[PDB]
Design an enzyme around this catalytic site. Structure first.
Site, short mmCIF file in Angstrom:
data_model
loop_
_atom_site.label_atom_id
_atom_site.label_comp_id
_atom_site.label_asym_id
_atom_site.label_seq_id
_atom_site.Cartn_x
_atom_site.Cartn_y
_atom_site.Cartn_z
N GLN A 73 1.97 2.70 -5.35
CA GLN A 73 1.52 2.55 -6.71
C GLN A 73 2.26 3.37 -7.68
O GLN A 73 2.29 3.19 -8.72
CB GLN A 73 0.20 3.15 -6.69
CG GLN A 73 -1.05 1.94 -6.56
CD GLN A 73 -2.43 2.83 -7.02
OE1 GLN A 73 -2.24 3.75 -7.35
NE2 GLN A 73 -3.13 2.24 -7.19
N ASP A 123 -5.93 15.32 -4.86
CA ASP A 123 -6.58 14.55 -5.88
C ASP A 123 -5.43 14.04 -6.39
O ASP A 123 -5.08 12.92 -5.89
CB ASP A 123 -7.63 15.28 -6.70
CG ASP A 123 -9.39 15.20 -6.33
OD1 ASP A 123 -9.68 15.77 -5.53
OD2 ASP A 123 -10.00 14.30 -6.84
N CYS A 126 -7.29 2.96 2.04
CA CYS A 126 -7.67 4.28 0.81
C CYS A 126 -8.86 3.67 0.03
O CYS A 126 -9.77 3.29 0.54
CB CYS A 126 -6.52 4.58 -0.10
SG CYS A 126 -5.03 3.35 -0.52
N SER A 127 -8.36 3.53 -1.18
CA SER A 127 -9.46 2.98 -1.99
C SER A 127 -9.17 1.86 -2.42
O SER A 127 -10.23 1.15 -2.83
CB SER A 127 -10.04 4.12 -3.01
OG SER A 127 -10.86 3.51 -4.04
N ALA A 128 -7.93 1.65 -2.72
CA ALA A 128 -7.60 0.14 -3.00
C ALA A 128 -6.95 -0.62 -1.77
O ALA A 128 -6.71 -1.60 -1.88
CB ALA A 128 -6.60 0.09 -4.27
N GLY A 129 -6.38 0.19 -0.94
CA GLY A 129 -5.56 -0.06 0.11
C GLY A 129 -4.02 -0.57 -0.26
O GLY A 129 -3.10 -1.04 0.52
N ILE A 130 -3.61 0.13 -1.17
CA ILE A 130 -2.06 -0.33 -1.77
C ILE A 130 -1.36 1.05 -1.81
O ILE A 130 -0.30 1.08 -1.20
CB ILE A 130 -2.01 -1.18 -2.94
CG1 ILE A 130 -2.05 -0.68 -4.30
CG2 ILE A 130 -3.26 -2.25 -2.82
CD1 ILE A 130 -2.31 -1.49 -5.25
N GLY A 131 -1.86 2.07 -2.25
CA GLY A 131 -0.90 3.20 -2.69
C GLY A 131 -0.77 4.06 -1.60
O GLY A 131 0.49 4.06 -1.33
N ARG A 132 -1.75 4.79 -0.90
CA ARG A 132 -1.49 5.53 0.13
C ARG A 132 -1.25 4.79 1.55
O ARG A 132 -0.59 5.26 2.06
CB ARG A 132 -2.60 6.64 0.16
CG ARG A 132 -2.71 7.66 -0.87
CD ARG A 132 -4.09 7.61 -1.59
NE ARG A 132 -5.04 8.86 -1.25
CZ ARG A 132 -6.06 9.04 -2.02
NH1 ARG A 132 -6.82 7.98 -2.50
NH2 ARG A 132 -6.81 10.10 -2.04
N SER A 133 -1.87 3.91 1.54
CA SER A 133 -1.67 2.93 2.54
C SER A 133 -0.19 2.38 2.90
O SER A 133 0.34 2.42 3.81
CB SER A 133 -2.80 1.95 2.53
OG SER A 133 -3.82 2.22 2.32
#
Ligand SMILES: N#Cc1ccccc1O
Length: 282
Positions: free
Chosen positions: A262, A181, A215-222
């Site tokens: 991020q 998380d 991901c959920s925004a497509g920026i951080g993890r992606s």
């Protein structure tokens, strides 16, 4: 500088929010007029994350061709990615129209459906073999074929058809499900290990369309997975191996989509990944 020695001076020296901030500001800031149209307002998952007009993936439909997604071309390496947000309840049909249209072999999902107590996306794939899904709007049918659950990730094979037309392409879904998380994993071995699994699939290669990643925004993890991927690529291919600079690469990716990576927790993690992957690259 051999990243490993600068990972050291940086971590030894206490400075990531230091270097993160330096990356931020120097990043590109293009236009994103399509995404703010009023007519497109429900199609966006977040208020601050949109695709730039120049690198957006355009749905081939008369009505509205907007999806919050972007095409990432890394030239020297010869890889293109499709980065995106977690589909929303109402953009699931658009999601699969764009996998069909761009000719991709793989979706790589880096979050879970409910993370931190909230819904980070719609469950957009069938949970059972026996109950397929139909996207009446885009005239497509989706069917689960097989499904392997491992410790750190889940692999699925699915079939996408054009109802409207009779074509079938098989699609593979790589799902990362064990990213805590808060933060980033304490070791990167699991992440590297999933990356490689994806590399073995055909899912990231040239004879195919670009893999969709989200991901959920497509920026951080992606941004993290991609960045690692492109970098290992370059060290692999150069005459000159520590002539691979993560930051300059990150900034290049950033030409295509906003806010990738991020946090400073995730940059740094980025560098580990990379370094640890650069012992195989033997
Ligand atoms: N791959 C790649 C890349 C990274 C930074 C700048 C230019 C490139 O083609």
């Amino acid at each position: 500088m051999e990243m490993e020695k600068e990972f050291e001076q940086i971590d030894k020296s206490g400075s990531w929010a230091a270097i993160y901030q330096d990356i931020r500001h120097e990043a590109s800031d293009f236009p994103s007029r399509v995404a703010k149209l009023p007519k497109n307002k429900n199609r966006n998952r977040y208020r601050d994350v949109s695709p730039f007009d120049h690198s957006r993936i355009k749905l081939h439909q008369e009505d509205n061709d907007y999806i919050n997604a972007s095409l990432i071309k890394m030239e020297e390496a010869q890889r293109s990615y499709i980065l995106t947000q977690g589909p929303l309840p109402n953009t699931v049909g658009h999601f699969w129209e764009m996998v069909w249209e761009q000719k991709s072999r793989g979706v790589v999902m880096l979050n879970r459906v409910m993370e931190k107590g909230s819904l980070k996306c719609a469950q957009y794939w069938p949970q059972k073999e026996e109950k397929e899904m139909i996207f009446e709007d885009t005239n497509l049918k989706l069917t689960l074929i097989s499904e392997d659950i491992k410790s750190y990730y889940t692999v699925r094979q699915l079939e996408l058809e054009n109802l409207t037309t009779q074509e079938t392409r098989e699609i593979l879904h790589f799902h990362y499900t064990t990213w805590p998380d808060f933060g980033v994993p304490e070791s990167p071995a699991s992440f590297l290990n999933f990356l490689f699994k994806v590399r073995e699939s055909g899912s990231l290669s040239p004879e195919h369309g670009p893999v969709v990643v989200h991901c959920s925004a497509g920026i951080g993890r992606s941004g993290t997975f991609c960045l690692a991927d492109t970098c290992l690529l370059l060290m692999d291919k150069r005459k000159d191996p520590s002539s691979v600079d993560i930051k300059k690469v990150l900034l290049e990716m950033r030409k295509f989509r906003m806010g990738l990576i991020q946090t400073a927790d995730q940059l740094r993690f980025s560098y580990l990944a990379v370094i640890e992957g650069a012992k195989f690259i033997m």
